[PDB]
């Protein structure tokens, strides 16, 4: 079995509510927003360590959060069934802007871009951008592509979404009017895929196994990786602290790091007691990061008090 990890920077934290939490955003190091199932919707001041629910005058409570983004105080929150919110004052206030009943699928992801700016996918892979505040959307992308398993976007706001079979993923890119497919690259079943650091994606493929785009070609795909060397336990998402540390969180509280930019991974054995599957990772600084779960549960990074930088 691979060594066990030194120090455990996940500290759990139980959040006022049993609801599945989705999506997590700051407006700088200490406010910010989380959102998930059940129109569920909560605050924080200190950076992370507590939260308050924030309750919506909603026509329903049915809604679910799939994705919230802010750029300073303007903040942007999408669901399902299709709803948008906006604030212009760090959510002090929200407003919910009517969105087209022509919007092909429901949105699935949003992105603040400053400034009344905003970029938004629907879960069929329809791209609107706003320049206004959201009182105009220019569509970028209509034709369609399907329900997609998972969607990622790079810092220069690129898009990979994997198939919904995972039989294949699909890039965009601003400029581009249609999404671009890409078939056989690989002959293992898709889960979830991104971006590194350095301009190459990341795959996981179901069996526990990653891969890494080849920075010649991000076309071509090197070795399939095993971290843990068994089969028996599947990823589920992989995100960067550092361009050199990774961490990957699975199925049974598997929660691995990697030091080497993916290549050797130790596993942190300290949250297999944490009852939640961890589905998503997020960082948002070096000393800044959370793990997304079921039943309220939230993990918080912790620096190490002994690491110098």
Excluded at 24 to 36: A, E, K, P, T
Excluded at 60 to 88: A, C, K
């Amino acid at each position: 079995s691979i060594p066990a990890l030194d120090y455990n920077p996940w500290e759990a934290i139980q959040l006022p509510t049993t609801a599945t939490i989705l999506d997590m955003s700051f407006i700088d190091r200490h406010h910010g927003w989380l959102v998930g199932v059940n129109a569920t919707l909560m605050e924080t001041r200190d950076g992370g360590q507590t939260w308050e629910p924030r309750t919506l005058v909603l026509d329903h409570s049915d809604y679910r959060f799939n994705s919230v983004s802010f750029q300073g105080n303007e903040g942007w929150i999408v669901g399902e069934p299709p709803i948008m919110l906006h604030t212009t004052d760090g959510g002090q206030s929200w407003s919910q802007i009517p969105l087209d009943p022509k919007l092909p699928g429901s949105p699935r992801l949003i992105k603040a871009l400053g400034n009344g700016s905003a970029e938004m996918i629907t879960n069929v892979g329809a791209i609107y951008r706003t320049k206004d505040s959201g009182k105009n959307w220019q569509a970028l992308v209509q034709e369609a592509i399907g329900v997609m398993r998972n969607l990622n976007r790079s810092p220069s706001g690129e898009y990979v979404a994997v198939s919904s079979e995972g039989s294949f993923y699909s890039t965009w890119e601003p400029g581009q009017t249609a999404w671009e497919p890409h078939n056989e690259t690989t002959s293992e079943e898709l889960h979830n895929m991104g971006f590194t650091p350095d301009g190459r994606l990341w795959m996981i493929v179901n069996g526990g196994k990653i891969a890494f785009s080849d920075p010649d070609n991000s076309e071509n795909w090197g070795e399939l990786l095993s971290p843990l060397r068994r089969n028996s336990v599947g990823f589920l998402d992989l995100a960067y602290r550092t361009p050199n540390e990774v961490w990957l969180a699975g199925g049974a509280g598997a929660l691995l790091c990697s030091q080497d930019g993916g290549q050797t991974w130790q596993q942190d054995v300290d949250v297999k007691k944490v009852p939640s599957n961890f589905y998503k990772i997020l960082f948002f600084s070096p000393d800044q990061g959370f793990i997304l779960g079921q039943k309220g549960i939230l993990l918080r990074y912790v620096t190490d008090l002994t690491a110098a930088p």
